[PDB]
């Protein structure tokens, strides 16, 4: 600190520094995320060996490339843990799980500000567009009643949990956005779920997303107006998995050009916890 | 202005040469000057004072000439001249105090008091006598645009400044790097520190630098350079940059490695000295650039090696410093120094008579505030007032 | 200018600010860690209610101070997750658990930055003095097999696992120092254990350790020539555990005077491995 | 003397006076303290004779060295009356008495201004950080309850003495630190104990402690932050008690040096 | 004479003093209210103080104008007087200190010593024109 | 000298400036409170900003009166001085920059360079009467 608020004065017409691509590849590390159905068709014992010899062509040393698995998009969102320095995640397109792909890319491609929440005691409201309610666990069902100026429910009853209305039903990861001004009374199955409010900071620059198949289904914002398309939401086609891994190993240089590290956190969690 | 010095020169010589018993040929040319003062000054009338608590006095001159007919001067001739000198020497005191107290912003080199404007007529030019003092010689050379020069002993060229700079910091304040300095009077004491003692620096060498710009160009200076800052050598606690918290500084001191002192003029290196301590010269400069570096010692006895570990708790912090001091130099504008008392005569008149703050000079004649913003409008006023203070010092100490 | 490292210049004549030690008590939070045999000796349920009145005298609000508990040093060290602003956990001395207490304070008092490890694919080495191997889990049994420049074992066969050197068996936390600069081969039982390499950045500021009883043993630096005693290491002698609790409530200004906020928690440390 | 008023100027470059250590020996006393079993292993009857011949070599006169004993740390600490000019004690290290050796050296090495306490009639708070409660006797069982503003108990009942919160059970010497500002109702065993309201001052310089045994266990402060080791909290290692006394007789000029007189 | 001629409050560097015969310095120590953990270990609450606090000033007269004669750093009139008395082995008289000790002479600087000291510095100034 | 001689507030076109040595421009950006649908797409609330806001000014001195010599766009006194030095291959001296660089000469425009520059522009003005 103390050099935060001070200005920096550069200039035009100075000589460029040389390349950084080789020294980026030496010290740093890289680790991709692939589903279980990838290695099933591949069914090799040492295909992790075969790939790591091919990353060695593109400047990465031996002990810098690690591989991790997950069952599906639902099982991947129990705890989103980002281990290494540069992350890529590989998502097969499902025509049904269309929100759940968009819920995953919202949490991973952005930074969050998570405070704890106690729903059986208090009343909670949202502050602005940046305040969201993010719940994750085994299975939980969020039921919310709007409330009024004198703490009387609008279209519900504060003592009845049947007159509450639901916004989720048995989902691994839920991001709930409600109306701004009013308070709300919550009903979450707390035995299998942990709901917290979190604030969206600027985006995270450790991670990119590759859709394996399909078309783009990506409102990672909450408003319906912006459905932005940054350069880390990529998409390819497929009929064999070997072509997918050969595309990643060949074009590391185009991907790493967009990744832009040193947004790495000190932990491996997807958020920041306060209290 | 030239005739105000010429009044004071032949009143100083009149109290020195007109003594009892002296031969007449010793004073045969002074009396022709002193009689020719009186003829010019008779019939005129003057008025001094009026600003602050300085009282208003009226002056009127009606005197008789001195005798030019003795062989040895006697006590009648001395005592009839002392009661004429004592009226003129009281007149010159009240003109010099009337001029040191006034100032202008448009053209400060012109006379400001009412009496000194009246003495600048061609009627009064025949009182002009020799101009042999240092300040009246530089008043005349600079008035024709010729090159001048004032010789000083330890000139007050640096404003007072005591601060630091942290090139590496964190809120715990336990692994720091940067420099500390004191610039005051004619002396620079800079000291660079590094808590880790270059354990992770490339080739275990940490580079420091400190650049001091001047306000005026100095010429032919004699400079003493010594390889220790004795002021930044003891343990102390220092506040933070914004006064929030305090931080601790416990030094041990190595020797400065690879010292380079440069003397710049418009960005051009005039002189340079590399690992050369003692007395040095500097012929023409306006910017001093000190450069020195810390090197971790490669061989250490067991008493030394405990002081500098590899891990984080650093209880003994490394320190490298220098010390520079200007003994004497030649400038072209007026300054203050340690030998002559021309600044002390100006402020003592303004403080005594309760003079209000004018448009040019800082409140209270603060020299730190005056050399910081040393504009060309303040330079013309400061020379005009130091020159009048030099004229008054001949008659009245 | 979040990631730029600009210098600061401050004077030596700036007047001091005000006292500030009574605002920090309003905003910040405090967490206490005690072994579960404390509440056995106390014989109360309202002692959490009782002490919260006693912190209110020193300046803390009613909702700031949080109480957490553990069973022993072995089970607390499985995953110490320390969440509040100012953390103060007092452990009990044991003459036989002498290394296991100092391995706990190596994690807590400092801050480690960790990269994952894959034992099956890769061979590992440590680069400098900061690289240690931190493994924690239900039961960790680590075996090492050092290698020469030809990929052959020195005193170990790379096929037989019984010839391997052994550094730990069945612990909850092991910090391993090996010779810096030699490629090794590992035999961690990763069914109940999880190893990853870590390098030490600096001290973790916001946490203190109060040893309860026993002599002065603590060795952060796994280095024989250095055993430093920082200001956030404290020892007291006990006979009863009420008198321990009245001591820490009385001297809350001196506990907090010697520990600052976490430098990674601030918005200043934006792209310098935040939190 | 000592004076917080009445400044004393003095000067520099005044000549150092002669070594007055010998005159200090002739006009002072010295009193050693030992646990009772130290006289048991020696099992001489005239061992107090053979030591006073050896203090005479170092300049102590033939009427100035006195030997006193105690049973243990538990029994010495009921009323330590130290009144010689110079005093040193010999504490044998016990591992389980680690908390009792710190409480004794707190009482021995520091000055205390004490005041009485009436448990039955008054309510007591602690004002200063340096305000502590010292209780001595045969069996001290101290029970403490805090207080709100409305004269009502916080975690106890001001009538029921069972619901209190005790800090000591049957101990010869207890030094009690409670949070400052809150009033308290007390309940102690007044028949075999005497609790008092003492206040800490600077250290006592006529006493010194030689720990005889294991490691340094001395937090003679009250906060957990500081645990200093001063000039005269010292320690040796032993195998024979008869060898321990030779070291004390030999090095008197260093033990006397780190301590001062009564004045 | 007990009257405040000049005063300066937290103003360092070069200052002036127009007329004075007594200098009165005043300064105070203030404990810093905020301290980092490296500073807070130095100053405990209890008795063992191993690091002692210190506050100081430094004053220096560069040039002044007096009315009686004195000694200074530029001219050598005191050195010419003592060198004559030391060379010719002159006994101690009734006025000046033994050996012309300046510390003993400015301590008790009586008006009887002032008239002698001006009479001898003036003769030493006349001799310096001819014989250096 | 830190004193405001003239000031102008939201006044464009031609302005005057009677005596100055420092120009201080001040201007601010304000987000428009009402926006048509073609404008509102440009400025979202979230992070991807593809259209960046910009506010600028432009100042230009047409004619002024200085007291030291300078260069300008009408007369060719600087061009006559450099053309003589370039033609006869003159070595770099102690005062002027190498090649008579005007950017290097007005950056450090010392009083020693001002007296030389007036002495040479005046001689170049005398030569321009006879030989163009
Ligand atoms: C100690 C002092 O005089 N300084 C004042 C203090 O009295 C006041 O209580 C505080 C309020 O924030 O502001 C400080 O500047
Ligand atoms: C025994 C001893 O140490 N010698 C000192 C001697 O140096 C001193 O000059 C004399 C007068 O004070 O007193 C003696 O005791
Ligand atoms: Ca409803
Ligand atoms: Ca909302
Ligand atoms: Ca083997
Ligand atoms: Ca190692
Ligand atoms: Ca109770
Ligand atoms: Ca207390």
Author numbering:
A (entry chain c), C (entry chain n): 52 to 326
B (entry chain N): 1 to 397
D (entry chain m): 52 to 314
E (entry chain M), F (entry chain C): 266 to 397
Question: Which sentences from the paper describe this structure?
Answer:
The infectivity of rotavirus (RV), the leading cause of childhood diarrhea, hinges on the activation of viral particles through the proteolysis of the spike protein by trypsin-like proteases in the host intestinal lumen. The RV virion is an icosahedral triple layered particle in which the segmented viral genome and the polymerase complexes are packaged in a capsid made of the VP2 protein. The external layer is formed by trimers of the VP7 glycoprotein in phase with the underlaying VP6 shell and 60 trimeric VP4 spikes, which project from the VP7 layer, that clamps them and partially covers their base. This outer layer is responsible for the first steps of RV infection: attachment to cell surface receptors, lipid bilayer penetration, and release of the double-layered particle (DLP) into the cytosol, where transcription of the viral genome is initiated.
To obtain high-resolution maps of activated and inactivated particles, TLP from cells infected with rotavirus in the presence of trypsin (TR-TLP), or in its absence in medium supplemented with the protease inhibitor leupeptin (NTR-TLP), were purified by density gradient ultracentrifugation and characterized by SDS-PAGE. In contrast, for the TR-TLP, the proteolytic products VP8* (28 kDa) and VP5* (55 kDa) were detected as two distinct bands. Three-dimensional reconstructions (3DR) of NTR- and TR-TLP were computed using SPA with imposition of icosahedral symmetry, achieving resolutions of 3.40 Å and 3.48 Å for NTR- and TR-TLP, respectively. While the density of the VP2, VP6 and VP7 shells exhibited a homogeneous high local resolution, the spike showed a radial decrease in resolution as it extended away from the outer shell surface, with particularly low resolution in the body and head regions. The resulting maps provided sufficient quality to support full atomic modelling in the foot and stalk domains, while in the body and head regions, a combination of backbone tracing and rigid-body fitting was applied (representative examples of model-to-map fitting for each region are shown in S8 Fig). These enhanced densities, together with the icosahedral 3DR of the complete NTR and TR TLPs, were used to build and refine the full asymmetric subunits, including all VP2, VP4, VP6, and VP7 chains.
